[PDB]
Amino acid sequence: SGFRKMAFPSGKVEGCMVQVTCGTTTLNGLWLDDVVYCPRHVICPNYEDLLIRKSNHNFLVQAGNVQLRVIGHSMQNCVLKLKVDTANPKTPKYKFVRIQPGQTFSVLACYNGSPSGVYQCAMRPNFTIKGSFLNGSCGSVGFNIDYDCVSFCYMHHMELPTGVHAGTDLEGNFYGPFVDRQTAQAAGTDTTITVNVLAWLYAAVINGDRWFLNRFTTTLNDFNLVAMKYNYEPLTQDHVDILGPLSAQTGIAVLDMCASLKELLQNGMNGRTILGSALLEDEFTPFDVVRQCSGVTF
Amino acid sequence: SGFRKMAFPSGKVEGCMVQVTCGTTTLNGLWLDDVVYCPRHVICTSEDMLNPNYEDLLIRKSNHNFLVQAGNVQLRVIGHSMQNCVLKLKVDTANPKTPKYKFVRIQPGQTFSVLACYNGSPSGVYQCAMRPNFTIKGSFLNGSCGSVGFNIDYDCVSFCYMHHMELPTGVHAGTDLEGNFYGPFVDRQTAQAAGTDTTITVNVLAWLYAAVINGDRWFLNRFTTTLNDFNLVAMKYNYEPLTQDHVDILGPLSAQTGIAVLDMCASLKELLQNGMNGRTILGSALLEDEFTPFDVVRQCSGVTF
Numbered sequence A: 001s002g003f004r005k006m007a008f009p010s011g012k013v014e015g016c017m018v019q020v021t022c023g024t025t026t027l028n029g030l031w032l033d034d035v036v037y038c039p040r041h042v043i044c045p046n047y048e049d050l051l052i053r054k055s056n057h058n059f060l061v062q063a064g065n066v067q068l069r070v071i072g073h074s075m076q077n078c079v080l081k082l083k084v085d086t087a088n089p090k091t092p093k094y095k096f097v098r099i100q101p102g103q104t105f106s107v108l109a110c111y112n113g114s115p116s117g118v119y120q121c122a123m124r125p126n127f128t129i130k131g132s133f134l135n136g137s138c139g140s141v142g143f144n145i146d147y148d149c150v151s152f153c154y155m156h157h158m159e160l161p162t163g164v165h166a167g168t169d170l171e172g173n174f175y176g177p178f179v180d181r182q183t184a185q186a187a188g189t190d191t192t193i194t195v196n197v198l199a200w201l202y203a204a205v206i207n208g209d210r211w212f213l214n215r216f217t218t219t220l221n222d223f224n225l226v227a228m229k230y231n232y233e234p235l236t237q238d239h240v241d242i243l244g245p246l247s248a249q250t251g252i253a254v255l256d257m258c259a260s261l262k263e264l265l266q267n268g269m270n271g272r273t274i275l276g277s278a279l280l281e282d283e284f285t286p287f288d289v290v291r292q293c294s295g296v297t298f
Numbered sequence B: 001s002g003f004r005k006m007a008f009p010s011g012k013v014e015g016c017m018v019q020v021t022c023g024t025t026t027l028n029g030l031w032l033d034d035v036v037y038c039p040r041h042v043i044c045t046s047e048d049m050l051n052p053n054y055e056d057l058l059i060r061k062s063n064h065n066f067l068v069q070a071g072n073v074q075l076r077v078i079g080h081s082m083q084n085c086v087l088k089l090k091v092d093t094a095n096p097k098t099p100k101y102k103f104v105r106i107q108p109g110q111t112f113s114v115l116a117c118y119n120g121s122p123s124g125v126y127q128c129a130m131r132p133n134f135t136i137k138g139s140f141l142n143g144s145c146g147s148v149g150f151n152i153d154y155d156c157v158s159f160c161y162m163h164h165m166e167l168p169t170g171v172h173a174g175t176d177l178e179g180n181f182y183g184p185f186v187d188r189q190t191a192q193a194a195g196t197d198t199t200i201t202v203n204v205l206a207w208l209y210a211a212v213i214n215g216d217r218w219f220l221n222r223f224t225t226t227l228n229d230f231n232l233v234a235m236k237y238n239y240e241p242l243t244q245d246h247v248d249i250l251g252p253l254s255a256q257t258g259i260a261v262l263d264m265c266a267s268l269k270e271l272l273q274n275g276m277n278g279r280t281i282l283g284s285a286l287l288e289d290e291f292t293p294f295d296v297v298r299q300c301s302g303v304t305f
């Protein structure tokens, strides 16, 4: 029993974190084999012009108490790839994957190449993340672990004026319409991840919280008309299919659970809580609910 | 900016997790140097749990009855002893991944990270608090026994909790790493229930100071309160009494924000009376009590917004 915002164990990622310094800027880098990946704003804009003025020895890379020697450099989108002479002996099995809004991942927050904390978060529909980052956190990475393979999906680049965060995949492509420069940038109006709220309602049922269940059902179209009114993302047939296993385990049809959600949106919780929360939680995917209510190990 | 329930990076603890099997029971163990620590109930057979005589069950065991697996490698047990509710298995290999560590016993209100494991393999990491009733609101399934709680201040891992059991309300009970249980609990299947839980007042205050640091003051008021008047009100909402020690501990956060502890107490008193009226504080519609004053200082900026 119990339901917590759980992150993947961060060990395999901790062994990849390094400090990257260029001039007066210090941030975090990800050392995999003989390459260190970090945000290109460490050279700071005309990034080709700023980069051509740099030599290998201008980049100081520190792994623990050991200096790594930079022997090459190149830029890929908004990521700087620093070739080093030493391959990371702690390099785990890994992939670079680009995630979609609604997907969750673990963030290992680092400062000066040293990990300070791990937390779980979701890629919002507006492509920002509600993270916890201070100055110096740039280069901190997001990941998921499947068996023994680490799938790196996020690299932290910046904080927006509302306190939320923006970054790239590990190939340097931004999530969202953001740019790596000090210009007028703002997060778009966010929405609630509907398929995730439904997954969390199924987790509440699995843990014994059933007060919100009702005898009613709904069509997908009627549910989507109500979802649009409350700034909830549209629920698709793919979402209904993905929720299939949780529907079978609890005996509550997806559209039957949609009718419970509709009543919660139209009437509130009325002094009650669900899994110790007075808000409808949307940062647990259907897979996160299955994994936490089954004890999958890595 | 931002405020999340943040756990410590679990790497140093992952390298210590092993699987311990005795007969038909399999659970997790903590391998530090040449000793594996695990709950002593690994030697019980379910029926034993009603009234187990651990000394009697243990005397019938030899070293080779305990199977310890570290990854894909079997460790050889060369000695065993019981210390309170923990079994200490001496092994022939010292853990080369043993971090710098201490065993610390914590007080209610203190927070820690939990590395939840099954079959000696870590599955997830989350942040917890020792409730005032000595239970923890964890997320544990069958096979999680032996999972540990810890803090990593600086480069030293301080182990403070080992998971032993789930109570009928879904909450969890366990011991420090010397095998002493937190709370009036026993490692026996007896009628045992968690006492009435209360809200950790000093932690809610710390979290209100974190909200002010991050730029929110809507909940503040022009009033102050005495410590005694605050406690008379707080006790009516099932909040733990606030002591002079708590007021002293909140000193640094009071100086950083310019808001006296008893002025923050007056704000809390009003929040308990009025609720939030559609508003949130740090993305929460409830008053959060699982961040200590230390956690707020650790995570938040030194400059107030």
Ligand SMILES: N#CC1CN(S(=O)(=O)N2Cc3ccc(Cl)cc3[C@H](C(=O)Nc3cncc4ccccc34)C2)C1
Pocket: A041, A133, A134, A135, A136, A137, A138, A157, A158, A159, A160, A161, A162, A165, A179, A180, A181, A182, A183, B001
């Ligand atoms: N809005 C807003 C804030 C962030 N700015 S800034 O001027 O410090 N800033 C401009 C900038 C522009 C482009 C890029 Cl790619 C990076 C960056 C940097 C960046 O955002 N860093 C950070 C990242 N995360 C958490 C931070 C917390 C606190 C301060 C910086 C933080 C620096 C004011």
Ligand SMILES: N#CC1CN(S(=O)(=O)N2Cc3ccc(Cl)cc3[C@H](C(=O)Nc3cncc4ccccc34)C2)C1
Pocket: A001, B041, B049, B140, B141, B142, B143, B144, B145, B164, B165, B166, B167, B168, B169, B186, B187, B188, B189
């Ligand atoms: N209440 C209640 C539940 C737990 N029981 S039990 O019979 O499985 N159980 C009695 C028992 C008694 C004393 C001691 Cl020390 C250990 C234990 C064990 C224990 O609690 N295991 C677990 C531990 N954690 C999370 C669990 C989740 C799900 C099932 C077991 C879980 C076994 C029913």
Ligand SMILES: [Cl-]
Pocket: B103
């Ligand atoms: Cl010791």
Ligand SMILES: [Cl-]
Pocket: B105, B106, B107, B110
């Ligand atoms: Cl303590």
